[PDB]
Amino acid sequence: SFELLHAPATVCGPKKSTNLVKNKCVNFNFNGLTGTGVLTESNKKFLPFQ
Amino acid sequence: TLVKQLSSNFGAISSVLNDILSRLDKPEAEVQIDRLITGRLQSLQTYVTQ
């Protein structure tokens, strides 16, 4: 039984990570969160749990 | 309204096309995707008519 939640992954598949590119359009995957766009520093004050 | 409808999930397992495609195989995803296409097309037609 799996919980497909937005919460931090507790179980990950046997996958390898890459480095970040930034300031370029990229196809990204963050813990299963996927999409295409430009990654930049947000300078946003996220709470410690977000 | 037009934008919010994108997250409606019109009977599909998910409102996100990427999550359906990244989770189900072809013959299964096509069904879930078609549900979203019908709902989104109907939502867009409603917008244009108005």
From Swiss-Prot, chain A:
Top-level taxon of the source organism: Viruses
Annotated segments matching region Disordered: 6-28
Phenotype when changing residue 34 to K: In strain: Omicron/BA.1
Function description: Attaches the virion to the cell membrane by interacting with host receptor, initiating the infection. The major receptor is host ACE2. When S2/S2' has been cleaved, binding to the receptor triggers direct fusion at the cell membrane. When S2/S2' has not been cleaved, binding to the receptor results in internalization of the virus by endocytosis using host TFRC and GRM2 and leading to fusion of the virion membrane with the host endosomal membrane. Alternatively, may use NRP1/NRP2 and integrin as entry receptors.
Subunit structure: Binds to host ACE2. RBD also interacts with the N-linked glycan on 'Asn-90' of ACE2. Cleavage of S generates a polybasic C-terminal sequence on S1 that binds to host Neuropilin-1 (NRP1) and Neuropilin-2 (NRP2) receptors. Interacts with host integrin alpha-5/beta-1 (ITGA5:ITGB1) and with ACE2 in complex with integrin alpha-5/beta-1 (ITGA5:ITGB1). May interact via cytoplasmic c-terminus with M protein. May interact (via N-terminus) with host bilirubin and biliverdin, thereby preventing antibody binding to the SARS-CoV-2 spike NTD via an allosteric mechanism.
Protein name, per record: Spike protein S1
Gene: S
Residues of the full protein shown: 514 to 563 of 1273
